[PDB]
């Protein structure tokens, strides 16, 4: 179980994550209102949420998403688009672990995710920082589904410690680095990581532990099924680095489970 307040936040940032897949939300003019095709992001649409910056195939890593200003909720939200792909990104991106000592000593991270973030980090840092200066009472939140949640995690770990908090909400994110990095993400000051998983979603089970990857603690495990509305009683907090009580169980994994985090995610055209 989680509190109604935390539940509301999880639901909201799931929809900010879903919104990053809508193609119109990656080429939107600054200052325009954020909307989604169909029913992908009603909690976002119902807010005074507008684009600060919308980006597509940005940097050598081709990162896609948006930066939003939400006056209703007093948020600055950086949302990274993930992928439709359950498995193929294992074959298509470099899962070698690269040194990231500039983030944390002895830390290593996925080459692809880290390289991709690095290619856009200066530009996105400056935009986030400008927004913070204009709205110092607003909360900075980085979010994303799947590979987007991995990017949000790396980005948050990198940009914390510069005078404003960064919270991260990830949905169905893969592991992002080694045990040192997982430990760092468990204790890092300057914001909170909320790492959310669903039932037997395959993506948070990748890359394998035996590729040298570990998950940070804790985990917020959604136990309700695919296409089942989530209640606060359906979310279990699982403690421990590489804990096995939640998503990380030795049973058959699933791809459809990856697409249901409070509502459909990865399906907005
Ligand atoms: C954007 O949404 C606000 C309400 O949140 C509304 O006042 C405004 O007219 C909308 N803009 C456009 C161009 O429709």
């Amino acid at each position: 179980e989680v509190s109604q307040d935390l539940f509301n936040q999880f639901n909201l940032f799931a929809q900010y994550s879903a919104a990053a897949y809508c193609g119109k939300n990656n080429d939107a003019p600054a200052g325009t209102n954020i909307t989604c095709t169909g029913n992908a992001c009603p909690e976002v649409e119902k807010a005074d949420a507008t684009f600060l910056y919308s980006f597509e195939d940005s940097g050598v890593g081709d990162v896609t998403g948006f930066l939003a200003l939400d006056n209703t909720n007093k948020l600055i939200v950086l949302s990274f688009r993930g992928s439709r792909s359950c498995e193929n990104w294992i074959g298509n991106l470099n899962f070698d672990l690269k040194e990231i000592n500039d983030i944390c000593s002895g830390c290593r991270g996925h080459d692809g995710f880290t390289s991709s973030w690095r290619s856009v980090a200066d530009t996105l840092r400056q935009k986030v920082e400008d927004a913070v200066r204009e709205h110092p009472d607003y909360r900075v939140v980085f979010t994303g589904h799947s590979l987007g949640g991995a990017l949000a995690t790396v980005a948050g770990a990198d940009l914390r410690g510069n005078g404003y908090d960064i919270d991260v909400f990830s949905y169905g994110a893969p592991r992002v680095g080694n045990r040192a990095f997982a430990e760092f993400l468990t204790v890092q000051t300057g914001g909170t990581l909320y790492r959310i998983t669903h039932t037997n979603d395959i993506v948070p089970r990748l890359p394998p532990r035996e590729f040298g990857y570990s998950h940070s603690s804790p985990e917020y495990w959604i136990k309700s099924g695919t296409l089942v509305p989530v209640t606060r009683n359906d979310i279990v907090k699982i403690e421990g680095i590489d804990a096995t009580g939640g998503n990380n169980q030795p049973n058959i994994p699933d791809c459809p489970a990856h697409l249901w985090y409070f509502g459909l995610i990865g399906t907005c055209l």
Side-chain angles (χ1 to χ4, degrees), residues 4-127:
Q4 189 65 228
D5 180 59
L6 201 48
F7 180 93
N8 295 162
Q9 294 181 59
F10 287 3
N11 191 49
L12 180 58
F13 300 113
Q15 295 188 14
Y16 272 109
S17 293
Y21 290 88
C22 314
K24 289 170 163 190
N25 295 343
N26 312 146
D27 77 336
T32 60
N33 292 336
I34 303 174
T35 65
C36 299
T37 317
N39 299 306
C41 72
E43 300 295 298
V44 174
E45 294 180 338
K46 78 187 202 181
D48 175 9
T50 60
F51 290 102
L52 293 167
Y53 178 53
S54 182
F55 52 96
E56 181 180 44
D57 294 324
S58 188
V60 298
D62 308 322
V63 179
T64 297
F66 63 80
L67 182 67
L69 185 69
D70 181 341
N71 296 133
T72 296
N73 295 303
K74 301 192 177 163
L75 306 170
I76 295 159
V77 185
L78 179 64
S79 181
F80 293 99
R81 186 188 182 287
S83 178
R84 322 38 43 123
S85 181
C86 237
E87 297 185 358
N88 284 334
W89 62 275
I90 285 286
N92 293 341
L93 309 177
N94 187 345
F95 50 76
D96 292 344
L97 285 160
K98 200 171 159 181
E99 169 260 276
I100 49 170
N101 289 320
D102 53 307
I103 301 183
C104 45
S105 172
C107 295
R108 303 174 81 67
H110 185 271
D111 193 319
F113 307 147
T114 302
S115 289
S116 294
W117 167 244
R118 169 159 19 234
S119 74
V120 297
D122 284 354
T123 294
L124 290 175
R125 186 186 42 88
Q126 297 172 252
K127 290 185 180 298

Side-chain angles (χ1 to χ4, degrees), residues 190-203:
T192 302
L193 167 60
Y194 298 97
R195 186 173 67 76
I196 301 148
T197 62
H198 178 231
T199 54
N200 58 334
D201 178 356
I202 192 170
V203 179

